[PDB]
Design a protein around this ligand. Structure first.
Ligand SMILES: CC(C)(C)OC(=O)N[C@H]1CCCCC/C=C\[C@@H]2C[C@@]2(C(=O)NS(=O)(=O)C2CC2)NC(=O)[C@@H]2C[C@@H](OC(=O)n3cc4cccc(F)c4c3)CN2C1=O
Ligand SMILES: [Zn+2]
Length: 198
């Protein structure tokens, strides 16, 4: 009944993949209880840093990547949710279920990647565990893993970036191409598709 109808919480930034130095590593910035509270209020006072955030809802955790002043992630993780911010919940600026893509204005303190113009096919996927996995581009939205991985290894990394050698954004990881639980390739939203959305 109407009086007891609930609202979904906000997406909450709970960590980042630190790419600032010579070593990529995951950092947690909020534990489970704080995450739950922040999802409910939508008020996140934490300082945000970096290009790749680790984000959570009540039920899932995944990644989000800042490119050209927008924090992007997958619809299959975020749905239509707001994101928590210092001033309360922030509404999506982009939503496209057909691309599996959503975006919010990039948090103050975040750094954005630049869309790649290199037209190069040697790529690098960054996972939620801060693994940097070489990927050979095989089409507009596909790349092959030079070393195949169990899908367990990739789960929770949707929303993270594929980067070129010079560190530009080439795409956003969307889905694993897998057989018998082994991923040989990845499917990604190309950055040009983001640029068109913008
Ligand atoms: C498309 C194809 C070739 C048939 O393959 C697959 O459908 N494969 C599966 C394999 C699943 C096994 C785990 C794989 C491990 C990691 C996967 C990266 C990941 C993830 O980590 N999510 S998450 O845990 O962070 C989660 C919290 C955010 N995404 C998924 O699971 C996605 C989600 C779902 O797909 C979609 O809803 N759409 C909507 C699309 C719209 C347009 C185009 C698309 F392609 C779209 C794909 C199935 N998914 C796969 O990957
Ligand atoms: Zn580039």
């Amino acid at each position: 009944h109407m009086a007891s109808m609930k609202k979904k919480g906000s997406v909450v930034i709970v960590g980042r993949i630190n790419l600032s130095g010579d070593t990529a590593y995951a950092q947690q910035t909020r534990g489970e209880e704080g995450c739950q509270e922040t999802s409910q209020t939508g008020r996140d006072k934490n300082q945000v840093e970096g290009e790749v955030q680790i984000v959570s809802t009540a039920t899932q955790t995944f990644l989000a990547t800042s490119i050209n002043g927008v924090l992007w992630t997958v619809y299959h993780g975020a749905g239509t949710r707001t994101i928590a911010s210092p001033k309360g919940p922030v509404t999506q600026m982009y939503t496209n279920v057909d691309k599996d893509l959503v975006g919010w204005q990039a948090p103050q303190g975040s750094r954005s990647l630049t869309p790649c113009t290199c037209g190069s096919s040697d790529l690098y996927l960054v996972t939620r565990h801060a693994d940097v996995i070489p990927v050979r581009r095989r089409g507009d939205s596909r790349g092959s893993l030079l070393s195949p991985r169990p899908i367990s290894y990739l789960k929770g990394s949707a929303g993270g970036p594929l980067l070129c050698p010079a560190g530009h954004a080439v795409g956003i990881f969307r889905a694993a191409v897998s057989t018998r639980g082994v991923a040989k390739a990845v499917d990604f939203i190309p950055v040009e598709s983001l640029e068109t959305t913008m």
